[PDB]
Ligand binder design. Structure first.
Ligand SMILES: N[C@@H](CCC(=O)N[C@@H](CS)C(=O)NCC(=O)O)C(=O)O
Ligand SMILES: N[C@@H](CCC(=O)N[C@@H](CS)C(=O)NCC(=O)O)C(=O)O
Lengths: 244, 232
């Protein structure tokens, strides 16, 4: 039975995941994070920092098309960051996950942190998560393409006007929700805030759209953003992994 | 005791002991109607007339302040109290929990199913919808087609991810039909039907996504849910 015990150990380390051939794990007993500090990547590094889970971060170099490599694609077939491998997954077996949304939900369940205990407020929290994932992320990103990236050279500005109006409309929904609340779920800081902070920060910072979306006419979203940014875990998460 | 929910002032419940669905048979609305049909849960659907801006009334906004469909109220929510929910994704997860169905048994496979859910919610829906805007709706009038070309390319790329995933699988999660399939089928149907983009995205060059769609559309609950509620 020496062979059989080696077999059971093999299913608990990470050599069965082909991504590790390109980004080797130094700490096979820690969550492997494959990411960049983009608005989507930082959701997960922030969550990991807020939970105190040990992890090992790996920058994925998009300049070299490393997200298009067979090794990266074996974990996320969509070719995007973030992705993780949790060696201590359900049933003490390693689990790979892509999609920031699935990962945030996974880490909140794993740790019993950043999701209300109350069943109704838990469901409510997931609506706001889904709101960021289907609305905020994709729409702010389209604004970015037409304002900051290659879409900015297109002469017809109606696309740009469309994503500016939708980004402002989304911010207005946040603004009514944060009127009289500390966090999206009131006194509880949750994966809904962790999903959303980076995108708002990015919109008014890197994207250079602060005036474009009339951000400084808002009251409640700016104060909420300031609250999130004062959290040490947010400050840490925002710069992990270092850019390659 | 739904009286506390102001939406019922504009869309009264004839059956306050049943889930109230506020929706339209759009690619996002059909996710929830299909789920409800697949589960067999009693519910009472209400068409929300966008032609009359009804989704921007105080009554609708009290349930979804984002002013979109679908939305539900379950009178027999957690703690035998009513729960309002918006977002098709959150509703699918809630209904899967309510019924113990359309998620895999295995916890690892459950989290994997939620990946494909989120890939749909963050990728398929928003991108296919932008293609809709520039090919089917008002954006079709813009002479310069670079925006359209962008969303055609992204939608094809998304279909390419599904095509590789479905290669040798019956459903997205292998032998398990789940909320991942329920979330995605309507968007793919709509893309090649109502949006008129079947040739634009080179759909008939694919093998696995077309086969998967046919298997989904052969299900009676999908056929029922695709047309509920009836358009106002
Ligand atoms: N939807 C995914 C990631 C989506 C996404 O677009 N991520 C970006 C960075 S913010 C990326 O990987 N971009 C690379 C590419 O599009 O090739 C999530 O929320 O986890
Ligand atoms: N992320 C949402 C999106 C819902 C959505 O965009 N719904 C459309 C129908 S496909 C709508 O209600 N539009 C209303 C409006 O644009 O005001 C979900 O999946 O539920």
């Amino acid at each position: 039975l020496g062979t059989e015990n080696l077999y059971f150990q093999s299913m608990s380390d990470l050599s069965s995941f082909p991504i590790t051939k390109r980004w080797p794990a130094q700490h096979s007993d820690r969550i492997q994070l494959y990411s960049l500090p983009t608005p989507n990547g930082v959701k997960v590094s922030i969550m990991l920092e807020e939970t105190g889970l040990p992890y090992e971060p790996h920058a994925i170099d998009f300049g070299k098309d490393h997200q298009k490599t067979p090794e990266f694609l074996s974990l996320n077939p969509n070719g995007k960051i973030p992705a993780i491998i949790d060696p201590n997954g359900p049933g003490d077996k390693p689990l790979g996950l892509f999609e920031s949304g699935a990962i945030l939900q996974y880490l909140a369940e794993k740790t019993g942190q950043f999701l209300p205990a109350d069943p109704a407020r838990r469901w409510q929290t997931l609506q706001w998560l889904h709101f960021q994932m289907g609305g905020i992320g994709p729409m702010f990103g389209q604004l970015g393409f037409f304002h900051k990236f290659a879409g900015r050279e297109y002469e017809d500005k109606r696309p740009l006007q469309r994503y500016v109006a939708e980004s402002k409309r989304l911010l207005g929904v946040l603004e009514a929700r944060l009127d009289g609340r500390q966090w999206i779920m009131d006194a509880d800081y949750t994966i809904a805030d962790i999903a959303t902070l980076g995108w708002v920060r990015n919109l008014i910072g890197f994207y250079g759209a602060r005036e474009l979306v009339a951000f400084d006419e808002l009251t409640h979203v700016p104060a909420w953003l300031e609250r999130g940014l004062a959290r040490p875990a947010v400050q840490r998460g925002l710069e992990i992994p270092k850019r390659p």
